[PDB]
Amino acid sequence: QNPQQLSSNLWAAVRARGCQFLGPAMQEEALKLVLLALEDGSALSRKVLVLFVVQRLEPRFPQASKTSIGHVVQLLYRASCFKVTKRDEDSSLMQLKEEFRTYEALRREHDSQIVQIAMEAGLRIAPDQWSSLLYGDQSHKSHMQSIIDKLQ
RNA sequence: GGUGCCUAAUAUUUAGGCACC
Ligand SMILES: [Cl-]
Ligand SMILES: [Cl-]
């Protein structure tokens, strides 16, 4: 198992559960726009959360789509970041749980969920490679080692 | 077979399409 392999095996695993990582720049700006919509306790359907993040993301990142942002929203939902108000005959509304209404706390949950998908897929990826994959630098290895230890 | 993307749904997930290998 070389790195170019583990990275393509990691991203395919992620997309297999209907989730997505748009690269370290765009994913960071995607999460922030999710926080911009939700940090005040506003309650948005998937559809309105997607339109909000897509429309603001588009001018800097033209590849942003309802599908690609749906997949990022699915990653947060799969990480159990949302309070979901279920009503009859209507779309469920999503709020950010009180504990995940800041970027640091939301991002930790996001990183953790990608690591659980690596483990579900039997992928064994060291922290230097994690730092690279999620942040595009080597400045997050400890962060990553912290999430790996919690999950084991 | 496999990947990638697009469209749709109240999705801890589905369903459909195209492209490429
Ligand atoms: Cl409400
Ligand atoms: Cl809450």
Question: The domain spanning residue A2 has which CATH number?
Answer: 1.20.120.1790
3-state secondary structure of A118: helix
Contacts of A126 (CB under 8 A, 6+ apart): none
Q: Is-contact A35 A102, C-beta < 8 A?
A: yes
Which range of residues forms the domain containing residue A25? Answer: 1-152
- Integer CA distances (angstroms), A18 to A46, A75, A112, in order: 14, 8, 16
Phi-psi group of A48: left, alpha or beta (phi > 0 → left; psi -120 to 50 → alpha; rest → beta) = alpha
Q: Which amino acid is at A60?
A: R
The answer to whether residues A22 and A68 touch, using CB atoms and an 8 Å cutoff, is yes
Determine the distance between A55 (CA) and B20 (C1') in angstroms.
29
Residues with CB under 7 A from strand B: A 8, 11-12, 15-18, 20, 45-47, 63, 65-68, 70-71, 73-74, 77-78, 80, 82, 84, 86, 89-92
Beta strands in chain A (DSSP E): 82-85, 93-96
Name residue, tokens 């939700």: A38
Which residue, among A101, A44, A108, has the nearest Cα to A73 in the 3D structure? A44
What phi and psi, each to the nearest 5 degrees, are found at residue A114? -60, -40
Q: To one decimal place, what's the resolution in Å? A: 2.4
| Experiment type | X-ray
- Give the burial class of A29: count Cβ atoms within 10 A of its Cβ; 0-12 exposed, 13-18 middle, 19 or more buried: middle
What does each C-alpha distance from A145 to A9, A14, A79, A129, A134 come to in angstroms? 20, 20, 19, 11, 13
> Which residue shows structure tokens 């992620």?
A14
For residue A92, which nucleotide's C1' is closest to its Cα?
B10
CA of A87 to the centre of ligand 1 (A): 10
Bridge partners of A83? A95
Ligand nearest to the Cα of A81, by number: 2
Q: Of A9, A34, A16, A45, whose CA–CA distance to A129 is shortest?
A: A9
- Is the separation of the CB atoms in A21 and A134 below 8 Å? yes
